[PDB]
Design a protein around this ligand. Sequence first.
Ligand code: HEM
Ligand SMILES: CC(C)CCC[C@@H](C)[C@H]1CC[C@H]2[C@@H]3CCC4=CC(=O)CC[C@]4(C)[C@H]3CC[C@]12C
Length: 396
Amino acid sequence: LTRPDVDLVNGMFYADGGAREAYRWMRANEPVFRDRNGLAAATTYQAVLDAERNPELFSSTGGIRPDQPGMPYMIDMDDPQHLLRRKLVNAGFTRKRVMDKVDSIGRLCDTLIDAVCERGECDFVRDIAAPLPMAVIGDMLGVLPTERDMLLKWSDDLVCGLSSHVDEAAIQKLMDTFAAYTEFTKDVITKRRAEPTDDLFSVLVNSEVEGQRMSDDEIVFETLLILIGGDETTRHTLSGGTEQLLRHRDQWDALVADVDLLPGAIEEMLRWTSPVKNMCRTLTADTVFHGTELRAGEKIMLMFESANFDESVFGDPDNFRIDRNPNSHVAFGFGTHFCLGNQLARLELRLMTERVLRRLPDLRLADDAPVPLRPANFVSGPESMPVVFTPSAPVL
Ligand code: HEM
Ligand SMILES: CC(C)CCC[C@@H](C)[C@H]1CC[C@H]2[C@@H]3CCC4=CC(=O)CC[C@]4(C)[C@H]3CC[C@]12C
């Protein structure tokens, strides 16, 4: 009944377990809510949809983070500049193009499962959920296999860096990692200019925008956006979604018995886990929006998890149900910026989860205590997830 006392920039808010109670208050009392620091947030599904649908008023050019300015990548652009970038990269992410990767991604899943299946135990986050989407996007970008862990470590350092709650040495670590990624990329530019390859790095390196070559700085940021979209999102729906399947044994069992129930289960895993907790928009004019007066130039946080637990839309959002149908979640956002990777992510989720179901059919949590979550304010999910299963033989 009492107003939440919350800093939406504090990663602890997303990790401590209180967020969904706080969102319930917000959606009932103050749909466009201001936190203890005055930062506006769209908290109801309608408020998020309406802002998404009006980019003239709710611009992306001010930067998607609450505490950082506009940067040279497509997520911080409005149309028509944004669509020009999308047209450079869309072809590699369509459903048809993604479906061409069924065998290739399936082999990565079997490799990873081969690595643990004889042991009867693993850390589902470290051994399964994190590496698979890293390998997929790394192959798309032309990362050598032996370079995947290094890029993944950098990607972790960049997004774990995101909180008002971390010390100024965690801030230098953030900037040092970015500088590392920048020098790596500027060397990739040298290489793909001289020796172009088939992959997404090379396409960005050699791409044109406004009839001049894409800026080296925009190449840094666009490739970074694709990498992190790739390697810091799906991992959390794989681990947090599988957690919920383990906690609802009857649903796990239904899937083991009937793989045709999988597509629906994935949509519920997405809704439940909502890996991307928010994205900002900047007001281009003073307005009144769902009864909150908003000032030109301030940001508003689109709260996707809050929208995804909106009772007026889902009826019973607090039950996890693989049979939820339809499942109109906005884990991937909505509108012109609607997730580029969303078919890639769904196919990663399908192919891995099917192999886990088939090959580790008595999977369980090592203990049913809460799974620890990353206290960061942008992307977050399970930090680790020890699991156990009856050992079995490798397949590849
Ligand atoms: C479960 C996995 C994922 C989730 C929950 C997720 C979520 C999101 C969300 C919320 C946005 C912003 C949408 C908006 O503001 O309306 C977005 C944008 C984006 N995503 Fe994803 N994403 C995931 C996977 C991926 C993958 C695998 C990639 C590519 C490797 C990726 C690439 C991008 C890009 C490039 C954008 C910016 C698109 C644009 O501005 O037009 N995402 N995603
Ligand atoms: C999950 C995806 C859809 C979105 C991924 C967006 C990623 C690439 C964004 C989010 C926060 C961004 C960082 C914010 C802090 C920052 C300030 C700088 O002065 C250099 C660039 C960095 C180091 C930014 C690099 C790009 C990051 C890491």
